[PDB]
């Protein structure tokens, strides 16, 4: 009775995500990188594969019902921390290009001035 | 695509968060077949976690997360030479 909605509901979410997994691991961790050239295009693919797996191993560990969840939780803020870094790096790439194009527009106006 | 499939991951993350929130042992008492269905729904998890085991192919698990994050690090250091030298 009480378990009867949630267990079929969550399994349907597994059923929802189950084709998404197979399209995610369609081509290999080498292949899906080796087809790509930009390391920025290589970047989050490493993360996102780990990003799901982190939640995946946090999910299945609940099914054993083990009272500990720390040594995957200890891995959790790690994966955040590396996701924290290159975004702030990629923020700085903007300011490299954001202001250099204003340098482009300014010096043309100087001869115009 | 990140924003699509992770939104579906988030969808199942919350559903994974929705799983053992209820008291689960009570119908494991009331039948094995609740537990066995919960075992069978874990057999999805025995398959769906294995998909990325297949991508490679607990103490097993403690190994490769290094080797996952191994390859994260050599990006930014190359990105350091790709950008800070640039």
């Amino acid at each position: 009775e009480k378990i009867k909605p949630y267990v079929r509901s969550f399994s349907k979410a597994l059923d929802e995500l189950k084709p998404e997994i197979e399209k995610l691991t369609s081509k290999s961790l080498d292949e899906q990188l080796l087809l790509l050239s930009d390391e920025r295009a290589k970047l989050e693919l490493i993360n996102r594969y780990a990003y799901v797996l982190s939640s995946l191993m946090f999910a299945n560990m609940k099914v054993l019902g083990v009272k500990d969840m720390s040594p995957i939780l200890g891995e959790l803020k790690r994966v955040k921390s590396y996701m924290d870094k290159a975004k702030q790096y990629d923020n700085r790439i903007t300011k490299s290009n954001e202001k250099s194009q204003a340098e482009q527009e300014k010096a043309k106006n100087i001869i115009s001035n | 695509n990140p924003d699509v499939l992770l939104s579906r991951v988030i969808n199942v993350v919350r559903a994974a968060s929705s799983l053992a929130s209820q008291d689960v042992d009570f119908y494991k008492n009331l039948d094995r077949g609740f537990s066995k269905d919960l075992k069978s729904k874990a057999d999805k998890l025995a398959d769906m976690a294995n998909e990325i085991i297949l991508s490679i192919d607990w103490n097993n698990f403690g190994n490769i997360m290094d080797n996952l994050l191994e390859m994260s690090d050599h990006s930014l250091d190359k990105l350091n030479c790709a950008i800070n030298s640039k």
Binding site: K2, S55, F58, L73, L76, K77, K80 | L6, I10, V13, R14, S17, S18, S21, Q22, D23
Partner: peptide, 14 residues
């Protein structure tokens, strides 16, 4: 709405 906060919420519990 940082994308690790879904690890942090307490679920809907009966």
């Amino acid at each position: 709405t940082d994308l690790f906060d879904v690890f942090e919420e307490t679920p809907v519990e009966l």
